[PDB]
Amino acid sequence: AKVETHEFTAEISQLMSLIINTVYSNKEIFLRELISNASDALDKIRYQALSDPSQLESEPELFIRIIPQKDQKVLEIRDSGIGMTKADLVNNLGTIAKSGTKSFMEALSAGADVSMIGQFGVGFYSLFLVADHVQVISKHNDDEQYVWESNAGGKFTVTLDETNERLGRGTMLRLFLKEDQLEYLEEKRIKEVVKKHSEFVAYPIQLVVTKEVEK
Numbered sequence: 471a472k473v474e475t476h477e478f479t480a481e482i483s484q485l486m487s488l489i490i491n492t493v494y495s496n497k498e499i500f501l502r503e504l505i506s507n508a509s510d511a512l513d514k515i516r517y518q519a520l521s522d523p524s525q526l527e528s529e530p531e532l533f534i535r536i537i538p539q540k541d542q543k544v545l546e547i548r549d550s551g552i553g554m555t556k557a558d559l560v561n562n563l564g565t566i567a568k569s570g571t572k573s574f575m576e577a578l579s580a581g582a583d584v585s586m587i588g589q590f591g592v593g594f595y596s597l598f599l600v601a602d603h604v605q606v607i608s609k610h611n612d613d614e615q616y617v618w619e620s621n622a623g624g625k626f627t628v629t630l631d632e633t634n635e636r637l638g639r640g641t642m643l644r645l646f647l648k649e650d651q652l653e654y655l656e657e658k659r660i661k662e663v664v665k666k667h668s669e670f671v672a673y674p675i676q677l678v679v680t681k682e683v684e685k
């Protein structure tokens with residue numbers, strides 16, 4: 471029930487500051503990056519399930535689900551992948567993310583397109599193109615459901631999840647959209663971006679749409 475605060479490594483907080491402030495034109499590549507991460511997490515549970523089919527019982531369906539929350543100015547990207555333990559959420563640091571972050575920043579200084587972020591293994595942080603803060607809700611088969619939270623600053627929190635829907639297994643990113651990036655709540659826009667950048671995905675990409683029942 472305690473909110474644990476942790477500090478990012480310097481290189482991660484440097485990267486998040488660059489991304490949250492960039493005026494880069496093609497911000498829609500965030501969604502490709504998060505879909506790719508979701509797909510990778512799904513691949514990992516599928517791989518475990520091949521030897522042990524009981525690892526799927528926590529959530530039998532393998533999906534990616536996009537949930538616009540228009541009233542909250544939130545976009546949720548959910549997967550039923552392997553998920554992250556509390557120790558996985560606290561271990562964003564001492565990771566390959568450290569190696570990805572410094573060389574990507576150097577590449578950006580040399581003129582690399584921001585869309586190359588995924589090639590450096592740090593495409594998660596592309597969410598700061600469109601969002602000023604994020605909650606990462608995750609449930610691994612070996613642990614309880616936890617919430618990781620960040621505002622692109624130096625600090626993050628990890629809290630035992632007593633407030634969100636149960637994932638069963640997997641991860642949900644809750645993006646708190648910037649006031650100029652509310653186009654990513656619209657069905658038409660999300661469909662366009664998925665179709666353009668995420669044609670080759672092995673799992674269903676489900677879009678959750680809320681419409682008024684009319685006369």
Ligand SMILES: Nc1nc2sc(CNC3CCN(C[C@](O)(Cn4cncn4)c4ccc(F)cc4F)CC3)cc2n(-c2ccc3c(c2)N(c2ccccc2)CCO3)c1=O
Nearest residue numbers: 507508511549551552553554558559562567594606618641
């Ligand atoms: N939707 C998603 N769902 C999943 S689920 C998953 C599991 N990740 C674990 C990582 C540790 N692995 C252990 C391994 O390292 C694998 N290994 C083996 N040999 C080389 N490596 C290892 C090491 C030693 C060993 F003895 C055994 C091992 F298995 C297991 C999978 C990660 C993940 N993200 C994700 C994608 C990209 C990211 C982040 C999260 N970030 C991030 C963001 C916020 C909080 C924490 C983190 C920040 C950077 O980018 C998703 O977005």
Ligand SMILES: [Mg+2]
Nearest residue numbers: 525610611612
């Ligand atoms: Mg296990």
